[PDB]
Amino acid sequence: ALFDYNATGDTEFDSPAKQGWMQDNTNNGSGVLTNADGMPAWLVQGIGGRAQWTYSLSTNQHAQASSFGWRMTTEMKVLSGGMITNYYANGTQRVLPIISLDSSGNLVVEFEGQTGRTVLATGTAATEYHKFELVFLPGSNPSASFYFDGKLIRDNIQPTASKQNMIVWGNGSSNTDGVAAYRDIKFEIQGDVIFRGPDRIPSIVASSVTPGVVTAFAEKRVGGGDPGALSNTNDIITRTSRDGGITWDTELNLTEQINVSDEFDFSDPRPIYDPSSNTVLVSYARWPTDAAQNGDRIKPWMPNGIFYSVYDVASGNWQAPIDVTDQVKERSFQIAGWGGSELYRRNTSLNSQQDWQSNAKIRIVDGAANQIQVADGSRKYVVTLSIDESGGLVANLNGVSAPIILQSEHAKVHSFHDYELQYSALNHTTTLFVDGQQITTWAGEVSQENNIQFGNADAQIDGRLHVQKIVLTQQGHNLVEFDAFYLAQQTPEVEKDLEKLGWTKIKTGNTMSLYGNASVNPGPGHGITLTRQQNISGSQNGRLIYPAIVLDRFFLNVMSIYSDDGGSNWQTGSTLPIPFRWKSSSILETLEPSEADMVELQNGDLLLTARLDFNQIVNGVNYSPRQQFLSKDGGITWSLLEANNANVFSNISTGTVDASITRFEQSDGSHFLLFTNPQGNPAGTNGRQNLGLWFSFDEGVTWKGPIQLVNGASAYSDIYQLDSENAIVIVETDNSNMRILRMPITLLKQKLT
Ligand SMILES: CC(=O)N[C@H]1[C@H]([C@H](O)[C@H](O)CO)O[C@@](O)(C(=O)O)C[C@@H]1O
Ligand SMILES: [Ca+2]
Ligand SMILES: [Ca+2]
Ligand SMILES: [Ca+2]
Ligand SMILES: [Ca+2]
């Protein structure tokens, strides 16, 4: 909440009294509106008496200020005298700076409870306008910091005993004469509730084209709880502010319109602000109301998907939801030959004396030894697909020495492609076509085998491939047909077991296979629009991107979901690379990245921070509850940053929870990163308490100790830059009530060192 006075000549507000303040003078104390350089100001005349203005707060507001912190900003000029007291007192204590001009005319400040003084300005500057700021941070040892024209003057100011209870500005003394002119006074209490529990999972973004416009989101949880519960119906809600996050409009339900009979739960609002169009595009997940991510209950044949809504900042209008599920939710049969081999073979009766054709729509997730083969009783033709050292897609044909580079662009390297083999009986050769393009022709190798086979073929070579369709035809007749794209989306009644569909499974070592992805989810927090991609091959400025959560069947991981056309068409990137180990031919030990957030570094690389759920130890290495990753290709592929985990954030909570990360750019052009997460209580322990703020001045290599922003419950949070000097934070607190904090980042940065 904001309590202020803005000097103006406008009749309706031409005095502090018309702006809610109460006059509190004595004897000859008075005041008058003064005009100088075309800028009005209120002149406090405390000569021969006290001259001040006060604002009373409710018992509840004082309690809120003490619990969540406050900030007082003043723009004034001291003309003469002393005891210029602009401060805040509650029914117990106060932080009191005393401003004055000394006998020589210097502008100085003293603090009740401290000895001595500090000279702020001398010469003509002593009687010119200046901006004063007092910031109070909550905590076990609450203290305030004083700033003069943006510069830290005194830190760790301890509150002093006082029975006064009110916000005050002016000359607070009947005996000491003081005269000062005020252009503006602002007292702000932090922590206003924007969304009430049981609603949860906050995110926020702000407009740079239209300063002051902020849009926040959360999950409206009727019945409470995570999505997937029969006892709840969850939707996405939003509120907008046009004054920098001070006042907010009516809570708006964005998904109710596409949840007409409460058959779904919607979750994880992931907003992205696009400066090119001055719009906010928020993506979110849909789930059948009775099954979701938790416990892997969601299945490929269920209504999980992703939708987005667009907000036009200029006119302040929202647009109806748009479904993009078919673009980002993969449907396929997946074979992970990680630590083993798994092939499927169907014996056939091909006639080598006549033409035949085979088609296989395949995507290579990683590794090698991934193949598709056809043997016709005379010759065997095998295509082995792999990812080379450069990250390109390579094909090797049996009997042909030189490998064939199919794709070099990372996005194309891991996408689905249609591999068609056309055998010519007259020419005794087979031609390979990829996506309709003729690639090469070869003779294969002598063989008496007659079959079609696919999968990962080497227990000693890791590889994962996904298949959507496999067909074999001869003389206008389909000998074999496996439509995994179709089967993945069917209910359990439909037969999907390959071994029951005419195929023989040949497996060695440890492997796993499954149908399509069970679900996709944008995750909690905000997304970003890239702007420093000029030197990133395959990427582009303007790309909209967020780190989504994908569940194949049993395990969670993160992958980028992005759009290079403003949000109309979306694509997916590769999942994060994580270690794995089989404690034997049976127990899988790996990681499960989930709630993630990313930021674009100065050189175009993307830094991602992810929550690590469930198992965190692999082969004796503890990856902690949080791990950072880096992408050098616009978010298509990632690399795990060794030793860059929870340990880089001093005093961070040891419990798994969602965090937030964002870029902050100052007016001078300089920049740095901001990160929010609970510290725990005591700090460094497991608990969703005391939200902290960390800074990185070296592109995420190191972070500077946290500044505590909240004293009490603190769970999920999101932070975003509001303007050149402030950042806005939305955070879950008591009973998950989500509150707003507006932090003076350029001032707080000075409390670090
Ligand atoms: C900042 C402050 O507390 N000012 C208070 C002063 C000071 O205690 C004395 O001037 C000594 O500095 O005492 C008053 O009775 C007064 O003079 O009007 C009330 C006023 O609120
Ligand atoms: Ca409803
Ligand atoms: Ca539900
Ligand atoms: Ca987050
Ligand atoms: Ca699981």
XYZ file of C-alpha atoms and ligand atoms in Angstrom, residues 24 26 49-50 52 83 85 87 94 96 98 112 162 164 166 168 171-176, ligand 1:
43
model
C -0.085 19.021 12.975
C 1.986 24.463 16.888
C 6.538 26.473 16.030
C 6.140 22.924 14.748
C 4.348 18.864 10.053
C 14.811 19.175 12.868
C 12.049 14.947 10.420
C 9.930 9.240 9.471
C 10.854 4.266 15.094
C 14.421 8.676 12.952
C 17.169 14.216 11.516
C 18.364 9.005 16.841
C 9.001 5.571 20.778
C 4.511 7.874 18.522
C 2.149 7.696 12.539
C 5.357 12.069 9.566
C 9.681 20.216 10.858
C 8.993 18.165 13.975
C 10.022 20.635 16.675
C 8.397 23.627 18.368
C 11.691 25.097 19.597
C 13.971 24.393 16.623
C 10.784 14.281 15.899
C 9.964 14.452 17.165
O 9.757 13.485 17.900
N 9.497 15.670 17.418
C 8.706 15.916 18.609
C 9.332 17.037 19.440
C 10.783 16.731 19.801
O 10.829 15.671 20.747
C 11.449 17.978 20.388
O 11.394 19.042 19.448
C 12.903 17.688 20.749
O 13.621 17.312 19.583
O 8.554 17.239 20.642
C 7.214 17.682 20.369
O 6.552 17.832 21.577
C 7.299 19.029 19.652
O 8.285 19.766 19.870
O 6.379 19.355 18.875
C 6.471 16.667 19.482
C 7.280 16.328 18.225
O 6.647 15.270 17.518
